[PDB]
Symmetry: C3
Subunit: 137 residues, 3 copies
């Protein structure tokens, strides 16, 4: 399925100097998120920093969620992943999307303004209601 | 979609001193899981410990699964994540839900009884059957 | 739901000495991926290595994706996880499936040929189109 999602641009560079997230191909599962920074940030081995995106989304449909994931190349080659490992975005969240960037490797890394630093997928979710039982089938 | 899921309470504190997992809002994607412990557990930097939840679920429908994820604040601010990174819960699993808690940071952390230590989402899954071919389209 | 997925065997050991991935039970969410290696690989604490699977898939339907995850036992007990944490497989990717294996613990680990080293789930995905607004509801 396809879905239109309302988005608010919070920093006027988003959609200009810092491109809006896009799907690379018709068959891509995820879109790439970019670092909305004024200057580069040096991240030493072991350290975590919070990177803004300059945007907010409103998924609004409670049957849908988004998940933020590391990029494959950054993660495998540079040890640049997420501090919370995976970021879960609720359908009712309307704040700025923030990225927890963590250096899990041994080499210092320069995070540049505008760099694709994470990816984000939209997946269907189910809200569970618990039915208390003494035994299962 | 919404789904009723059978759950068995294994420790009589679950639903009393240790609240049952709940969705914070109507639009939340995940519910928070709590540590079912008799006493606090100190987790040093680099170490992993297995934390019980005091409950079992039976999803039962093979078109559904659950995934356990770190909490955002614990992960980003405290370096408190999962040892297996993401925990996959099969539709036919009927054992106690166990949480692999890992300190990926530099500061020792006290895991308290009743603390929300992870989150869990229910997602649709597809069972694949492989069709062997010499070439793709 | 169930789905047939085209797969190409790239190494003639896959389906013979190295079994093809299978679901353990009718209710399993994921299938296990095996290391397609000529000889064992020793992975020291902190290090990452790229392990081939000897196969390619073509999901082809843009409403579906796959995610590669650590195994629970390897991750919790041995500190053997993924360097990119979670691996996202696009519906239009036709290359060999590669696994980023990372030792996040303190003990050296021997990766053997044919060993189940990761798992893979197929999940529905939604392609988002962004609708720019001044304010949300
Ligand atoms: O990586 C993330 C994760 C969550 N978020 C947003 C989206 C979520 O819906 C919202 C969750 O906030 P909570 O207060 O529920 C996180 P907690 O402090 O409980 O760990 O934060 C991000 O911007 N980046
Ligand atoms: O974090 C987790 C992950 C799995 N589990 C449960 C739910 C799964 O369906 C079940 C999987 O057990 P396996 O024996 O398949 C894990 P393996 O030893 O193969 O790595 O364990 C947890 O309680 N916590
Ligand atoms: O763990 C992984 C992740 C991706 N892949 C494949 C499947 C993806 O569709 C493809 C993505 O390649 P990209 O060039 O988009 C990754 P990037 O270099 O942008 O980080 O790589 C793997 O084989 N293993």
């Amino acid at each position: 399925m396809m879905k239109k999602i309302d988005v608010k641009i919070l920093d006027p560079r988003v959609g200009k100097e810092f491109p809006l997230p896009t799907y690379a191909t018709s068959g891509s599962a995820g879109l790439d998120l970019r670092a909305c920074l004024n200057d580069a940030v040096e991240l030493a081995p072991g350290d975590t920093t919070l990177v803004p995106t300059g945007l907010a989304i409103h998924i609004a449909d409670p049957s849908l969620a988004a998940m933020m994931l590391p990029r494959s190349g950054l993660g495998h080659k540079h040890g640049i992943v997420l501090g919370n490992l995976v970021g879960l975005i609720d359908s009712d969240y309307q704040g700025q999307l923030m990225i927890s960037v963590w250096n899990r490797g041994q080499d210092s890394f320069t995070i540049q303004p505008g760099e694709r630093i994470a990816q984000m997928i939209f997946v269907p979710v189910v809200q569970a209601e618990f039915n208390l039982v003494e035994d299962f089938d």
